């Protein structure tokens, strides 16, 4: 289509996302830089804390948007739902733009607030973990994103975007970070990966960026399929 | 307005808050001192543990004081709801006093049960990080409180596990910047008991930041 | 009174408790040794882990009992509920015995798996931790137990005219938490008992004079905290 | 009763399990190597993080299935339910095969990815630990599995399972059991990593990770008799 401009109710939805993806990148990267600025060892929340920031914020945010926009906060979630015709192309694109914009903004106030540490320690930016190759990173993003989007589909509440459960993704995000943080820093979310690439602006991070789009999009589509066979 | 002194139903609500905010500052600062007061590199709950004490106690307390007073435990929550024509001025003020009083009470005891450790380690009071500025602290309190009050509004059900979390999360980001306030009574209580010039000097941030975050919090649900 | 020795239905309830309090002391003290027994820097689940074992097991166990016997797992919970007369004297006593017995068994079952570690690493006992005095310990047990029993009262519902054990999920996640939280504040003070059976079981198995000397605190503190709460739910 | 293959409404269920047990062994062992590899003091997730990966993934996965396959992800869960004729022998066997296969794939997906560090750190496979004997390990698997299956039975419905309980019921057992047996309680989970890691010591201990959970499961089931 291309004529779904049903006033008020939607150019709102795209703003529900915005503000959402914003406080998502804030909190998390606000906690990922918190990590490293560490003068003393075993004195921060630790990677476990980082994993919780990501999972816990997706639980909180999907709870808050749930019946307003649906609660995507993530272009690969939007893409999976699109690829099932559970949303339209126009809504999908509007959402993805609002998410990528919000993401950039979040890793901004982080920047201001926290200067020096932001460019001193990875900048929440996602690059391939020293040691593994691009194929491994990609594979880990695929599977990671599959776990997320498989949970979302089952998190689809049938009562024309659908509602979404949260404690499940809360967890479905948390879990993937526990496995995936070492290898890539864990993305599973093209807007999250894009935002910090824009703000951190490093050649190495831009070089790896394609993985954080292609891996999640594939993992997401593989979901619509698992939800096609069955 | 003097429009209310209701037989039961309210001079109770202000007591639901009291006792609530009390065990809130107890538990937490009771856990913020028994980490600092540590001799085993690792053995202390871990900042992560502190963050859980704050989030987990707000989950428990809002659960208990849910249908009994609105479950505020926090003047910035009360203020947001007030600025929402969801609470009256008189109730709001009574709540904030009951919260600030309960908060003071919480700490005092911690500092009786363990005067030494408490005294020797910053009294769990909320100050400014030893490497940033007042503008950053304020900004971090604003945003932090926005995350909390935005969750509360959506946590209206004409309610817990969400704030449990909404508090927990903000502490994970904010503990290294201010100590994570987002709660003027929590910040006031330990300033009263710890009584340090540096902590009193920064105290305004823990009122103004949350009140602002709350007000932009009230209104985001205005353009939605 | 004395007639609720109702075939099946109850001499079962007292067994629901038993088996419960058993796997409670197992898991936890099974995790309190499994930490104290380290060699590598920060290689144990962490005290945070211990706090979770206690809170998380009370969530799981109250979930499993609930509509099978109420889900007490704790003489101070039973005592608070008794002091509201919503569990008769006879049921109360039967519960407390079943809890204290189960507790001994659990722990014992650990000293049985990790004979060596156990003793030499603290015994999973509840004492006064170096530094503080008996008055502080008592105060911390009182308040700690108040937080627990206040949560329980509010964790009570007028829901069972039809069925429970399978109802609109909540009742356990609150205490899960209400136990977890108190351990985060109280572990450094007296390891946190808030549970006379939990404190009794490991005192029986560990059998140290210092732990027996402090034991009264783990009965009197929780009973007071329970009554204080069990009163706050009258004048509230 | 074997009169059951009725096209789709099942050769699917056995695939719900497959894909489930797969991402279960992935995530976890993907996090168990992830822990063990990290150099730095207080770096990776922490044993606490590992315990969460196991518990949290069973919560997520039982949430995603259950309502359409029962949500077993575990031969000892299937076995307990079988003893309590709430499942047939044929379904039970099909499930256990699908779980053991998925597990191998998951473990085998972990390795041919982060192999270097992988092979260096016990493949995350279930073993015994320098401190306790076989009797202790077995006892700890029995009891551990009892806690799990007792929760499952109560996690049953009159209308299927409710997760946050097992989420937790798995998490808790790992906090107690990781030191002694790196926590088992799941024959497919133990089998998968034994197949991929392929060490003589791990194959020697493997029987414990079948017999312990099966006993713990039966004891639990039979608790739905005298209860």
XYZ file of C-alpha atoms in Angstrom, chain A residues 35 41-42 46-48 51-52 130-133 135-141 143-144 146-147 150-152 154-157 165 167-169 171-172 174-183 226 229-230, chain D residues 12 15-20 22-23 26-28 30-31 33-35 37-38 40-46 48-50 52-57 59-61 63-65 68 109 112-114 117 164 168:
98
model
C 31.525 -0.670 33.200
C 38.490 -4.351 39.472
C 35.325 -6.235 40.578
C 29.923 -6.418 35.604
C 28.888 -7.966 32.267
C 26.002 -9.660 34.063
C 23.188 -8.079 30.081
C 20.427 -7.056 32.548
C 38.978 -10.072 18.925
C 39.613 -13.712 18.051
C 36.564 -14.855 16.072
C 35.964 -14.196 12.372
C 31.372 -15.768 9.763
C 31.136 -16.593 13.452
C 29.934 -13.120 14.304
C 27.325 -13.333 11.612
C 26.244 -16.779 12.726
C 25.969 -15.601 16.346
C 23.848 -12.589 15.260
C 20.922 -17.276 15.909
C 20.707 -14.637 18.590
C 16.231 -15.945 15.835
C 15.898 -16.579 19.645
C 10.883 -16.612 17.799
C 10.037 -15.340 21.315
C 8.255 -12.292 19.903
C 5.061 -16.457 20.504
C 4.815 -13.160 22.416
C 2.157 -12.085 19.971
C -1.052 -11.435 21.845
C 4.166 -9.938 26.306
C 8.861 -10.755 30.871
C 9.551 -13.271 27.959
C 11.572 -10.861 25.834
C 14.436 -12.517 29.142
C 14.819 -13.426 25.489
C 18.960 -10.918 28.436
C 19.738 -14.517 27.552
C 21.203 -13.755 24.129
C 23.491 -11.136 25.715
C 24.863 -13.692 28.153
C 25.976 -15.927 25.248
C 26.844 -13.195 22.693
C 28.531 -10.318 24.606
C 32.021 -11.948 24.328
C 31.930 -12.489 20.555
C 9.723 -21.496 11.650
C 6.342 -24.648 8.532
C 4.483 -24.683 11.854
C 5.629 -31.051 14.399
C 10.160 -30.517 15.850
C 9.084 -27.943 18.353
C 11.317 -29.813 20.784
C 14.155 -30.112 18.337
C 14.547 -26.422 17.585
C 14.005 -25.750 21.309
C 18.903 -26.575 20.061
C 18.837 -22.901 21.052
C 23.492 -22.965 22.079
C 22.804 -20.071 24.391
C 23.988 -21.834 27.552
C 27.592 -20.400 24.266
C 27.749 -18.709 27.635
C 32.598 -21.193 27.095
C 32.056 -17.446 27.056
C 32.658 -17.449 30.757
C 37.434 -18.061 27.941
C 37.533 -14.524 29.405
C 40.406 -10.682 33.088
C 39.593 -11.039 36.813
C 35.780 -10.643 37.247
C 35.219 -10.485 33.481
C 32.628 -12.783 31.922
C 29.102 -13.228 33.244
C 30.031 -15.063 36.469
C 25.741 -16.555 38.435
C 25.463 -15.582 34.717
C 25.781 -19.220 33.700
C 20.801 -17.567 34.597
C 21.461 -18.786 31.055
C 20.188 -22.206 31.979
C 17.161 -21.086 33.983
C 16.231 -18.189 31.786
C 16.395 -20.206 28.562
C 11.628 -20.129 30.996
C 11.779 -18.671 27.463
C 11.595 -22.005 25.692
C 6.931 -20.213 27.137
C 7.394 -20.682 23.356
C 6.297 -24.283 23.263
C 1.837 -26.435 21.418
C 26.899 -25.447 16.847
C 32.394 -25.156 15.130
C 32.140 -21.462 15.989
C 34.336 -20.830 19.036
C 38.585 -21.880 23.254
C 8.604 -18.334 35.549
C 13.483 -20.543 38.460
